RNA sequence: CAUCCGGUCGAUCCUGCCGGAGCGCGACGCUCUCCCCAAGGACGAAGCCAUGCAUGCCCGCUCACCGGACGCGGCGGAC
RNA sequence: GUCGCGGCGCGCCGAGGGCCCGACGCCUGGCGGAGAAUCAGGGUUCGACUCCGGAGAGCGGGCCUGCGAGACGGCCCGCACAUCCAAGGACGGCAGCAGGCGCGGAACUUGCCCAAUGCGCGGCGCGCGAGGCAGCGACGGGGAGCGCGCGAGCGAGGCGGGCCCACAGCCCCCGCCGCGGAGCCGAGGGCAAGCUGGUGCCAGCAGCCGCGGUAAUUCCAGCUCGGCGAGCGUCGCGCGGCGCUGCUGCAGUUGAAACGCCCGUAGUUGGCCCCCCGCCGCCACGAGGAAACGGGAGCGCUCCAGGCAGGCCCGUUGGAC
């Protein structure tokens, strides 16, 4: 009945991107050139498990 | 680079005082410039003179 | 009134009717790469200048070829096309305008012009040299990215005298 | 044909255009005038008022939930509306007789979503916006 | 510079509307490194107005004080 | 009578004038045009505001001066407001520039100067809140940037000198030190973009379809990711979308829609034929009539938004149309 009820973990430090053109540079690299079988998605859990 | 402008020669001196505008002079050691004074106070002075009725050079 | 009324302005780009297209996307994000472009407001005004180029080019072609005003126009666009480098010399037919694309346009920016000259190794470098005031033009120091080369000074770029 | 053709038939068609757009609900909505006198607002793009009764309305039966909005009364006009305040827990910062100001929804002058009969949004109290006191930009404490 | 997409059904084709996608004019909200141009109490109150400024100049007429004042007169104040 | 024609006014006479090719009346949150927004072509909506023209100076009337005003930073009266009074009297009109109250969703300094463009008077000048300069200013438009590279270099910023300026800033140039800072929306579809923890048809999201009753791919948080970018998002209006107002170019058996039938006036539409003359429409050309805006020729304000400049050995340098 109490509004708010439902409304605690810290931020992770990481070093800022390079912003302005060199974002550019970074995402033609993401895509044309570094590598991103079974075709390929944009942050699936597979992908993401092989960094980890 | 480049750096262009404009001059004006005179032939004499009196020439130069007669045709040419004051802050120019002024700008130049040609002359001295009195320090202006604040035209707010003179439209005041004007008004408060036109106020006044036959002698008003007392205000 | 203030004379500043008199002033005129315009704007000099478009936005596409439907932003959300994957192709287009990728088409512009690789001539963005390509020619390390900064935002995407340039290749608007490229398509611009270019869609204006082309409706001139198709009124002037919808006309007779010994009318007045297409011979004065034609001639007229002829002229500024070639001086600009954009238009290969050796064409001198109005078609040929229509075939034109805008890696044309970029291929005559200052970046381009001092890449193909070897002067620098990326166009992200030129462009870090283009800021720094390190390039010149006719003895001239230009200091825009995006300032666009004549035929007639393509052999008059170098290096600034005065820079380090 | 059905339609008249002849080369001196222009102040015919002009007539039957004239008398025959005003039957799109849109064009009538737009340019006979009887919305504009019954909008609150009066083709305004959003009001000021004063919060009388705060109040919660239930959803629509596909639905199951209670909606929190207040009664406003506006200035200009002394007429009364109800408007709601979307986010989150954001009823706990509106307080009874307080000032605000009132929008409009996404659409024009119908019903938006579940919520039946409720035309406003809240967007100001007190002179802060409501989206900047939910994501703790500002805080009320002169209230 | 000649573009469509989602929603009535157990499924299907239509009519038909609802909604989305663009540009411009204003208001609200978050935020903001440098330079250039630039609008700005018009929006059913042509409602109310302290305070200061917005139209002066000068040929004629000097026994004025030591010719400058002031006044008469002329032009302008209908732009 | 008027500067003057005229029912403009008066006397007399006669009877007329306008109307579905829409009179008269009523309404308008009605100044008009040059033009603005939108965008295949045909069009729709707007046009307080820069130039031209009209009208007004609290409402309604009257008048003097003067070539010229039915003028209001000129006078007289009534009405509604307002002010000073040593209570008998006197006095005012910001829809001029700043500033204040009220109202509203909504809108800036009670600054400096005639140096420029012009106007008034005038011989080596004065004045001008016209106008110019500065201040506030994310209405808005244009140009650069928060790195490149395995080391060097350049910004913003500060301290000084020039140039400019009516006085000062600003831009730009020269010297010594040298603050490198990105947000707003979203991640089921339309529509580009997915991992744990909570809650449990509650709290909440959602323009539409819909989610939430124990994995919630949709709520609240963290990670990650996408779009635009010094800008992003929300609300209202207009154009487009819309061939859903249809001239181009809709539909009318059953989806919404052919009068129950006939006669018939206005209105709209009307077979074929004459070789040349006249008249109407039509096509082409031309004269005449403001620019600004728009189009457009030429010119490297470092580019650009712009502006009409500018080069020396210039169509008579140019501003064509
Ligand atoms: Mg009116
Ligand atoms: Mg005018
Ligand atoms: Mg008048
Ligand atoms: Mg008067
Ligand atoms: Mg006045
Ligand atoms: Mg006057
Ligand atoms: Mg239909
Ligand atoms: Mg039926
Ligand atoms: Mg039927």
């Known amino acids: 009945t109490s509004a708010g009820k439902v409304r605690k973990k810290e931020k992770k430090e990481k070093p800022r991107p390079p912003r302005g053109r060199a974002y550019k540079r970074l995402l033609y690299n993401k895509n044309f050139v570094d590598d991103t079988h079974n075709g390929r998605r944009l942050g699936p859990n597979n992908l993401l498990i092989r960094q980890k | 680079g480049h750096t262009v402008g404009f001059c004006n020669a005179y032939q004499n001196m009196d020439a130069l005082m007669k045709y040419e505008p004051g802050f120019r002079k002024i700008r130049c050691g040609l002359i001295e410039a009195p320090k202006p004074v604040s035209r707010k106070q003179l439209k005041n002075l004007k008004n408060r003179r036109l106020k006044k009725r036959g002698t008003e050079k007392a205000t | 009134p203030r004379i500043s009324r008199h002033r005129n302005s315009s704007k000099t780009y478009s936005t596409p009717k439907k932003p959300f297209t994957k192709p287009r996307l990728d088409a512009e994000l690789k001539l963005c790469g390509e020619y390390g472009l900064k935002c995407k407001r340039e290749i608007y005004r490229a398509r611009y200048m270019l869609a204006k180029i082309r409706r001139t080019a198709r009124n002037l072609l919808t006309l007779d070829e010994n009318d007045i005003?297409?011979?004065?126009?034609?001639?007229?666009?002829?002229?500024?096309?070639?001086?600009?480098?954009?238009?290969?010399?050796?064409?001198?037919?109005?078609?040929?305008?229509?075939?034109?694309?805008?890696?044309?346009?970029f291929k005559r920016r200052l970046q381009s012009v001092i890449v193909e000259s070897k002067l620098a190794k990326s166009v992200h470098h030129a462009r870090n040299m283009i800021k720094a005031r390190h390039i010149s033009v006719g003895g001239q120091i230009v200091n825009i990215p995006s300032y666009m080369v004549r035929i007639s000074n393509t052999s008059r770029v170098a290096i600034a005298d005065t820079s380090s | 044909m059905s339609k008249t053709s002849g080369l001196y038939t222009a102040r015919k068609l002009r007539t039957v255009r004239r008398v025959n757009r005003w039957a799109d609900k849109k064009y009538r909505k737009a340019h006979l005038g009887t919305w504009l006198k019954a909008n609150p607002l009066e083709g305004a793009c959003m009001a000021r008022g004063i919060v009388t009764q705060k109040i919660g309305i239930s959803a629509?039966?596909?639905?199951?939930?209670?909606?929190?909005?207040?009664?406003?009364?506006?200035?200009?006009?002394?007429?009364?509306?109800?408007?709601?305040?979307?986010?989150?827990?954001?009823?706990?910062?509106?307080?009874?007789?307080?000032?605000?100001?009132?929008?409009?929804?996404?659409?024009?002058?119908?019903?938006?979503?579940?919520?039946?009969?409720?035309?406003?949004?809240?967007?100001?109290?007190?002179?802060?916006?409501?989206?900047?006191?939910?994501?703790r930009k500002r805080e009320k404490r002169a209230r």
């Open chain 3, 69 to 105: 005003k297409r011979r004065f126009e034609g001639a007229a666009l002829l002229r500024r096309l070639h001086m600009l480098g954009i238009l290969d010399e050796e064409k001198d037919q109005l078609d040929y305008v229509l075939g034109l694309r805008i890696e044309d346009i």
């Open chain 4, 60 to 135: 629509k039966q596909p639905n199951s939930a209670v909606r929190k909005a207040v009664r406003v009364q506006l200035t200009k006009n002394s007429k009364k509306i109800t408007a709601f305040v979307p986010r989150d827990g954001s009823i706990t910062y509106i307080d009874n007789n307080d000032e605000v100001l009132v929008a409009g929804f996404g659409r024009a002058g119908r019903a938006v979503g579940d919520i039946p009969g409720c035309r406003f949004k809240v967007i100001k109290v007190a002179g802060i916006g409501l989206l900047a006191l939910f994501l």
